Structure formats: structure tokens, C-alpha cells
């Protein structure tokens, strides 16, 4: 079964992951694409493209806060709000991955610590087109130009994510494909400081086989889609590397700012 899977076991795993993904993540790629192409009967997202539209739109986006800081800082605080919720979502999803909760609890923590931001940037692509990103569960649309234009170094958090996303979105994955791919990323046996790699690699083996079958079935025309996708896993680590360097700059150059305790915990002694 989980030890020696045949096709039907792998399909069952794919479906289990798809169902828990639907349960864990409020906004799917399906719903996002419907929003981004106008093919839906909900009201359009509020478009945020400059300081004035941010001001006009802060009304319409789920963002809880105490209170006026500059625009770049306010966007960054927003990103912390969303990132914390995303980490919660991903943690709930990880618990649904067969075998994950049976791992040493310290290894569960290490896999999340390293995996969550990689998953955030992967799933961010689902909310993006080349001109901007859906925010606050599709209620808002923040333009790429606006985000790119934020004063240094805040703009540099943004544009690398878009650049990754347009290339990643060229693969045309759906939610059923992504549900397995994100599980694969979480179950990475090479994270620093793992205590017991073998049961993590056992789970990842099965996930990778499940992903490969899913891609062959769901994208029969898309030859070697499994292989291109695997190469994106190293790209995601580079996004993290660059991102952490910018956070380190911010920590020093912006004294009033401090990360949410969850995010401090994730970044503390990362690598």
C-alpha cells in the first residue's frame, strides 16, 4: 500500500492530497484563474496600483492591525499578516500528508521551517498574472508595477516572485497537480538538521511516484512535465536565499519593524 504502491494506490494518494488541499487553502488556482480572467459572477477585485488606491482599498482587504507609516512599510506589514495565515494553512495541509504526523515531532518542525516559504512562493504563482497579484482571498488585486516601484529594498521582495511565477505558470499545473508537488517539497530529506531522514525519504518516494503518474495522466500531451517541475524545486531555494538576505537588510536598516513571532521562529537559525 504505502510501502509498495501500484497505480491505484498512487491515484488514491493523489486524490487524498487534492481533497485536503481544497480543505486547507481557501483560494485555489481554479478560483483565482476564474477571477483573473473575468470568468466569474463575483464582483471584481479592488485594484491597488498606487498610494491613493491602497488608501481607498484598505477598506476592502482582510488585514488586522493596531492603527500612519509609509506605503512600503504598510505593504510589508500586510505581507506579514498574509504570510502568517499562509503558514497556518500549510501546516494544516502538512498534517494531512500520510505519514507526516508519525515522524519525530522535531523533524515535522524542521520540514515546515524550511518548506513553508517555498510553498508560499509556489502557490503565489496561482494568484498571479504578468500584471499583478490577487490578495485577501481574491478581494484585491495589487499591480506588479506598484509593488516593483516600492522604495529600496522593498521592491526587491516583489519582482523576483513575479519572474518565477510567469515561468512557473507556463507549466499549466492545476490544483490536483499542485497538491502533490507541494507535498513533495515538504517531504524533502535534505533539510538541515533532520534527525531521521529515512522515513521522510520513504514518504517522498511515494509522493514523487504519485506526482509523476498524475502528470502523465492529467497532462498526457505535456511530455517531461515531471522533470521541468523537479528543477523548479531548486529555483525556489534561490528565491528563499535572496529573500532572507533582504530581510537581514531590513532588520538592520528599519529599526521600528519587527517580524511576527511565528516568522521570527521560522527564520531563526534557518540554514
Amino acid at each position: 500500500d504505502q510501502l509498495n504502491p501500484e497505480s491505484a494506490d498512487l491515484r488514491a494518494l493523489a486524490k487524498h492530497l487534492y481533497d485536503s488541499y481544497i480543505k486547507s487553502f481557501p483560494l485555489t488556482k481554479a478560483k483565482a484563474r476564474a477571477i483573473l480572467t473575468g470568468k466569474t459572477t463575483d464582483k471584481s477585485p479592488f485594484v491597488i496600483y498606487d498610494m491613493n488606491s491602497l488608501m481607498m482599498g484598505e477598506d476592502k482587504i482582510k488585514f488586522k492591525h493596531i492603527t500612519s507609516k509609509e506605503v512600503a512599510i504598510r505593504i510589508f506589514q500586510g505581507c506579514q499578516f498574509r504570510s502568517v495565515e499562509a503558514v497556518q494553512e500549510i501546516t494544516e495541509y502538512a498534517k494531512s500528508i500520510p505519514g507526516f504526523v508519525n515522524l519525530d515531532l522535531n523533524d515535522q518542525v524542521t520540514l515546515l521551517k524550511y518548506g513553508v516559504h517555498e510553498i508560499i512562493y509556489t502557490m503565489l504563482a496561482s494568484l498571479m498574472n504578468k500584471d499583478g497579484v490577487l490578495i485577501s482571498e481574491g478581494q484585491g488585486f495589487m499591480t506588479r508595477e506598484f509593488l516593483k516601484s516600492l522604495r529600496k529594498p522593498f521592491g526587491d521582495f516583489m519582482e523576483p516572485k513575479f519572474e518565477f511565477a510567469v515561468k512557473f505558470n507556463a507549466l499549466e499545473l492545476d490544483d490536483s497537480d499542485l497538491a502533490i508537488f507541494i507535498a513533495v517539497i515538504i517531504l524533502s530529506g535534505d533539510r538541515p538538521g533532520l534527525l531521521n531522514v529515512k522515513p521522510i525519504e520513504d514518504i517522498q518516494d511515494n509522493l514523487l511516484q504519485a506526482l509523476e503518474l498524475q502528470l502523465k495522466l492529467n497532462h498526457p500531451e505535456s511530455s517531461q512535465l515531471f522533470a521541468k517541475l523537479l528543477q523548479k524545486m531548486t529555483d525556489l531555494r534561490q528565491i528563499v536565499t535572496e529573500h532572507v538576505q533582504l530581510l537581514q537588510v531590513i532588520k538592520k536598516t528599519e529599526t521600528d519593524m519587527s517580524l511576527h513571532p511565528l516568522l521570527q521562529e521560522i527564520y531563526k537559525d534557518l540554514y
Binding site: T91, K95, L105, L112
Partner: peptide, 10 residues
Amino acid sequence: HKILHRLLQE
């Protein structure tokens, strides 16, 4: 990793 542990527990 206090908060992550808490999230994993529930």
C-alpha cells in the same frame, strides 16, 4: 519553535 509546535498540536 513554540508556535510551530502549538500549530502542529492544534
